[PDB]
Structure formats: structure tokens, C-alpha cells
Amino acid sequence: NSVSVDLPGSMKVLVSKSSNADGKYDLIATVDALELSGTSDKNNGSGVLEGVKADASKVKLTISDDLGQTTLEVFKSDGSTLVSKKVTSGGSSTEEKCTCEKIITRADGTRLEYTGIKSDGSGKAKEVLKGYVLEGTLTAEKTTLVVKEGTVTLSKNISKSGEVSVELNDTDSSAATKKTAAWNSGTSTLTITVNSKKTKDLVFTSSNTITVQQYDSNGTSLEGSAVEITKLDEIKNALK
């Protein structure tokens, strides 16, 4: 049947031995476990092939009419989004990608800074607050800023819709110092529990601030009043 043709960048394209009704030739080529297929005016392997990934991508392979340069363009589920582009024009090959960044400046002065936003909506994220800085990552679903203290990991998740929800995971094994948190979305309050007893209430206010309130030894009543967090060290302390 078809014949294989060698292409720069260690690629290979299959082309039919004969043409079809309208004089065009078949082209079929596998690109890193993706099957591209198309038609061509010629029979030397040049032309345009196309295919899709598992994420419903749109891959376009363009082999120059003289078989000197191969252009592999990746596209989203629509085929109208220049994600990445690899051009092998003989000996050398050049790969091209792009990243974005978003700086949100809230009225009170606090900020959300997103760097290296991939085309899949992910990247690195940083929240600048009054007195401290939280760091973490960004996905299409949520920004996650992480604070770590000992074996405790506090995670503040800002949903794409700007919703705020906090969780806490402690790799501590002893059920005498192990912390376990519960989130109340109505009061935006994370209640920590150590040894079956409530211990601390962390409020993530509408002012983009965090307040700590301690429970009494009984584990049922809040003592004193809440206190605004002024520095990262105080959050770490609240996680101790």
C-alpha cells in the first residue's frame, strides 16, 4: 500500500501509492501517539495532515512542498487557538509557547498576582495582603494558597468565581496533637480541633484579612475577642 517518507525532526509520513478521484493523495502520520491524516496535491509527503489528542486537541502538521520544513501547530478543542508551535526547518528545530500574567489590585491595596499562566489555565499564584504574602498555585478550578507549619498545611482556595474556602490537613499521626479543621462557608470560619476539643477559629474577612480567636480549655466557648493577623508568623503560630 502506502509508502513512508522521512521528515526533519525524526518524523515519518505515510502517503498513498496512487491518487484518488480528484488527483489528491492520502497522507497519514503518527505524532507522539496521535494519528494525523489529510490529502495532498503531491505524492512526496508534503501537504497538510490533521488529528486530535485525548483532550480533544487539534493538531496540524504542515510539510513544506520541498520536504525541508515541518510545522506542527497545536490547537485547543476548537482549532482556532495557537497554543504551541514547533518548526523543524532542516537541522535545527524551534519550539514556541506563550504564557500570561494577571495582576488584580483590590481597592484596599491587596493583590492577586498570577504568573506563568499556561494555556490550560494553570500557573503560579501569589496573594499580597496587608503585612504578609501567601503563595501557591492556580488551576482552571481554583487558586490555592498554602501555608505550612510543622505537619499542618492550611489551604485557602479562591474559586474562579472569587469564592473563598479554607481547609487544613495535618500529617500528624497522634490524635493528641493532630489538628483537624472544619469549614463554615456562612461565617467564612475555619474551626480547628485538637484532641476532640475546639481550639481556634480563623475568620477570613471580607476585608481580605484573617482573625484568630482562641477557645477556652473546655473546647466550647470563645475566649477574649478575635485578633487580626498582621504577619505570616502569626498565621504559622495559629497553625502550631
Next chain:
Amino acid sequence: NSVSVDLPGSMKVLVSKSSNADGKYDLIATVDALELSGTSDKNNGSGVLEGVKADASKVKLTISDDLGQTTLEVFKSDGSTLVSKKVTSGGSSTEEKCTCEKIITRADGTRLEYTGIKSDGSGKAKEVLKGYVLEGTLTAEKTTLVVKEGTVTLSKNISKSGEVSVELNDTDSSAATKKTAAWNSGTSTLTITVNSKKTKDLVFTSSNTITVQQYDSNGTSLEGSAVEITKLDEIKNALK
């Protein structure tokens, strides 16, 4: 005459007191020492203004019909290139920019890696060679990779067209240890001169390699034969 209108992000737009022939109003607004002007169906300041920078930019200011959100889009000399975009929708304002990257893999395995490519064609650049790594910057005119040794700075410039040209600047003041280089583009050879005497010949080969040859004490004849550079330390030595 006109009246000023306050806009989120501490902006102000001037709008004519009366309409014109076709019922449209004038809008004029200065944005960080750029004058934007346009017409509107309304008289509350909403609408589209436009202007240009010194670099012949194309600035588009769009004030929502209810004066709640202001979108400032920057464009290149053509007005069809989304460079940057700042949206102030009330209390908070979000600024958006994008960057790109290009990885060139030469046949021999050496690479040119460009990160953080601004819209003006500039960014950071890195050349990966066989045994060492050169670092530097990228502009629309040339990539410049810099090696530094003492008061000597060697600069290898890869022109946009891929041309290679090397220069050397020594902040050394004494004309007894001060190095001064001369570039021969036919032989791709940089000849260093210390104390009026030729001392070293650095050849930047077509193999993406550097070779060092030492001059004899006389300063006219090349001794031994050229030697390929295997590590950054050897380049630094050649610059000593």
C-alpha cells in the same frame, strides 16, 4: 465648555456640554500623558476614546454605559495587537500581559532558549553549548550573551539573522594589564591585545564551539594549535 466625569481607577473623561450634527458627544481624556478622543451616543462619559503614544501605539479606552467598568487596551502601531489590558470594574482593577518563549534546538544538540519575551521583542536569553552555558539578554536587534572575568566583559551577539559577532570591554585602567579586543567577521576570530601585544585568538566555530590559541611573547605568531573550550572556566581563563 466640556465637563469632567470621574471614572474607576482614578481616571477622568471630558465630555462636551452639547451634542453635534448627528447627536453624538465629544469625549476627551488624558491617560498617563496620552490624549484620547472619540464620540459617544451618550453624555455621561461612557463610550470609546482612542489615542497614540510616542512609540506610535494605539490606546483604546472603553467606558461602560453605566460608568462602572473602564477597559484600557494597548495596541501596537497597527491597533490589531492585544499587548496589554487593564480593566477597572469598580473597586478592583486587573492588569493583563503576556510573554512568550522560544527553544531552538540545533542539530548538534546546542540550544538557544528565550524566556519572558516582551511584546517589544526583548527578554532573557540562554545558550546551552557542549559543556557550558552562556547567559544574557535578547532585544529586537540581537541576542547578547555575556561572560565576565575580573574587569573584562566578553559579549557574543547573535544578530536576529543569526549572525555571530563578539566584542570585549575591559574596565581595567592600566595599559599594562588592560585587554582590548578586535573582531574579524571573515574568520569569526576575536584577537585580544594586552599591552600593545596580541595575546589570544578566540574562534567561534560553525560547530557552535569556541577555540583558544595563544600568541607567543612576541605578539605576532600563534603558538601551538587552537584548543576547543570544554567548560565555562576555560572561557573565564581566556579572559584573565
